C-alpha cells in the first residue's frame, strides 16, 4: 500500500494509551510531566485542563544503520480502525526526497493512508500539551523547528529524537512511502509495553 508522511510532537497522551481500544496485553505507556512511566491507564490527558498524562520520551525514533531506522507514529489506514492499528507495526520504504530507498519499522501508538511520525520539534500542531508539561518547545506551532542547532535547547530526554530528523532523515519534507504490516520487533514493544494478540499473523523483519 502507498501513503504520505508528516511529522509531529504535541506531548499529548497517545490514543492507544487507553484501555479497551484493541486486543492487546496492555495499552501504550503514558508518562508524567517528568518523563516517568505511570501505571494508571485511566489517567486524564495532559492535553485537557487538569490533566496529568503525557507522551513518554522513549517513544522516539533512532538509527540502526544508515539505511534502517526504528520509531513510532500516529496512523490512519484506509478502511480500518483503531482496533486494527493500535500497537500494530509497519515497514515503510520511502519513495521520495533525500531518503528514497531507506527503510523504517514503526509501531502505531495513536491516531487516507497517512503516518504522522513522532519527531520532537516536528511541531505541536492543533494541541499543545508541551506548554503545560514543561513550559513549551521551541519552533513554529505548525512546522516546528527549521535547523539542527535548535535541538540544543530541548529537554535532554527529547534531544536524541530531535537530532535524528537532521542526521538519519536528512530533513526530508513529508516524503511518500510504500508500506506493509509486520510483526513488531521486540525493541519497539519494550518501549510501549503494548503487543497485539494477532502479531503471529504477519511476516517478520
Swiss-Prot record:
Q: Name one GO molecular function term.
A: cellulase activity
Please provide the record's keywords in A-Z order: Carbohydrate metabolism, Cellulose degradation, Glycosidase, Hydrolase, Polysaccharide degradation
Single biological process term from Gene Ontology: cellulose catabolic process
Q: Which SUPFAM superfamilies match?
A: Barwin-like endoglucanases
Q: Which domain of life is it from?
A: Eukaryota
Q: Which PROSITE patterns did the record assign?
A: GLYCOSYL_HYDROL_F45
Annotated active site residues, numbered on this chain, are 10 (nucleophile), 116 (proton donor)
User: Can you list the disulfide-bonded cysteine pairs?
Assistant: none
The catalytic activity, as recorded, is: Endohydrolysis of (1->4)-beta-D-glucosidic linkages in cellulose, lichenin and cereal beta-D-glucans
Gene3D superfamilies cross-referenced by the UniProt entry: RlpA-like domain (2.40.40.10)
EC number(s) from the headed UniProt entry: 3.2.1.4
Family (UniProt): Belongs to the glycosyl hydrolase 45 (cellulase K) family.
Task: Return the protein name.
Answer: Endoglucanase-5
Amino acid at each position: 500500500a502507498d501513503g504520505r508522511s508528516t511529522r509531529y510532537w504535541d506531548c499529548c497522551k497517545p490514543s492507544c494509551g487507553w484501555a479497551k481500544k484493541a486486543p492487546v496485553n496492555q495499552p501504550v505507556f503514558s508518562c508524567n510531566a517528568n518523563f516517568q512511566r505511570i501505571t494508571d491507564f485511566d489517567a486524564k490527558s495532559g492535553c485537557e485542563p487538569g490533566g496529568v498524562a503525557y507522551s513518554c520520551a522513549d517513544q522516539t525514533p533512532w538509527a540502526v544503520n544508515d539505511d534502517f531506522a526504528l520509531g513510532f507514529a500516529a496512523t490512519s489506514i484506509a478502511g480500518s480502525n483503531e482496533a486494527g492499528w493500535c500497537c500494530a507495526c509497519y515497514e515503510l520504504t520511502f519513495t521520495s526526497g533525500p531518503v528514497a530507498g531507506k527503510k523504517m519499522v514503526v509501531q502505531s501508538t495513536s491516531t487516507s493512508n497517512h503516518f504522522d511520525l513522532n519527531i520532537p520539534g516536528g511541531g505541536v500542531g492543533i494541541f499543545d500539551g508541551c506548554t503545560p508539561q514543561f513550559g513549551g518547545l521551541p519552533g513554529q506551532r505548525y512546522g516546528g523547528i527549521s535547523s539542527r542547532n535548535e535541538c540544543d535547547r530541548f529537554p535532554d530526554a527529547l534531544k536524541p529524537g530531535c537530532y535524528w530528523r537532521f542526521d538519519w532523515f536528512k530533513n526530508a519534507d513529508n516524503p511518500s512511502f510504500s508500506f506493509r504490516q509486520v510483526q513488531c520487533p521486540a525493541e519497539l514493544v519494550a518501549r510501549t509495553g503494548c503487543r497485539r494478540n494477532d502479531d503471529g499473523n504477519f511476516p517478520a523483519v
